[PDB]
Amino acid sequence: VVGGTEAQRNSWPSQISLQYRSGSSWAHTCGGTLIRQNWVMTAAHCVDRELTFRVVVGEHNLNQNNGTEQYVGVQKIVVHPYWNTDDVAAGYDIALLRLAQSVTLNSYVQLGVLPRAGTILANNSPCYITGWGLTRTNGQLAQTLQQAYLPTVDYAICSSSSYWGSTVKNSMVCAGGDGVRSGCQGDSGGPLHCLVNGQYAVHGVTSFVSRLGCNVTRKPTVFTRVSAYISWINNVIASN
Numbered sequence: 292v293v294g295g296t297e298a299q300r301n302s303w304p305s306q307i308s309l310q311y312r313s314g315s316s317w318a319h320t321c322g323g324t325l326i327r328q329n330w331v332m333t334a335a336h337c338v339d340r341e342l343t344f345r346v347v348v349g350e351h352n353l354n355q356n357n358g359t360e361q362y363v364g365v366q367k368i369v370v371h372p373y374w375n376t377d378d379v380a381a382g383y384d385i386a387l388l389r390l391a392q393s394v395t396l397n398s399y400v401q402l403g404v405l406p407r408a409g410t411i412l413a414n415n416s417p418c419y420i421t422g423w424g425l426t427r428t429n430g431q432l433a434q435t436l437q438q439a440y441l442p443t444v445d446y447a448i449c450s451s452s453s454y455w456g457s458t459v460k461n462s463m464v465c466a467g468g469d470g471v472r473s474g475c476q477g478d479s480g481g482p483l484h485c486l487v488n489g490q491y492a493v494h495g496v497t498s499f500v501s502r503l504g505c506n507v508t509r510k511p512t513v514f515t516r517v518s519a520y521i522s523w524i525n526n527v528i529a530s531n
């Protein structure tokens with residue numbers, strides 16, 4: 292997250308760290324959202340590689356014992372049928388991961404709340420992106436969970452020439468675009484928490500940024516619109 296501030300320990304308890312094994316250690320590669328005690332929602336492009344993955348919940352500092360983490364293995368990955376590896380711009384960048392075991396909920400570990408199907412947010416709605424990704428374009432990963440205020444940019448403005456044009460579809464939500472704050476490498480798959488009727492609900496799964504850099508004026512961070520996939524999600528959990 293570029294332009295972020297450190298998040299308090301118990302602010303976004305549905306956030307997870309998706310790690311794969313590298314050598315003898317595991318390395319953070321993407322974020323995610325706990326939606327069931329044994330189901331995580333992330334970006335399809337995070338789990339494309341044939342790697343061994345693990346989910347860490349209750350995580351705050353990546354390289355230090357917080358005394359609140361639970362480490363669970365991933366036993367089933369279900370990527371969206373229409374996802375196309377060579378195609379973040381086509382969409383369907385969503386994947387559900389079945390955990391090997393149910394995690395225990397407490398104040399650092401809670402389920403993120405999902406929006407009703409078809410729910411579209413008004414322009415400039417108040418949202419926060421969270422994650423441990425690069426803090427600067429070409430920089431390094433954050434050690435502690437960072438958060439950044441990222442108001443939405445509706446489809447009309449976002450698909451306009453000066454913004455993303457045709458690269459963005461209606462099954463995606465844009466947030467940010469100020470040149471100061473944004474998602475960045477390592478935040479992929481995490482939540483975009485938006486406040487609707489006094490409650491924060493996860494409206495986007497972090498997908499992509501500009502090839503020029505993370506914080507680019509008029510190139511808001513782009514997320515997969517969770518409300519476009521509510522039936523697919525329930526259909527997967529119901530049959531797995």
Ligand SMILES: *[C@](=O)([C]([N]C(=O)[C]N1C(=O)C([N])=[C]N=C1C1=[C][C]=[C]S1)[C]([C])[C])C(F)(F)C(=O)[N][C][C]N1[C][C]O[C][C]1
Nearest residue numbers: 319320336379474475476477478479497498499500501502
């Ligand atoms: C996300 O964190 C990342 N998303 C992408 O990079 C997706 N993407 C783009 O943003 C652009 N501009 C073009 N293509 C793509 C891709 C297509 C297929 C795979 S990526 C964020 C910018 C939201 C990530 F992709 F998952 C990623 O970068 N994760 C790796 C993080 N590493 C961890 C180790 O240290 C370096 C960063």
Ligand code: NA
Nearest residue numbers: 352355356357
């Ligand atoms: Na930790």
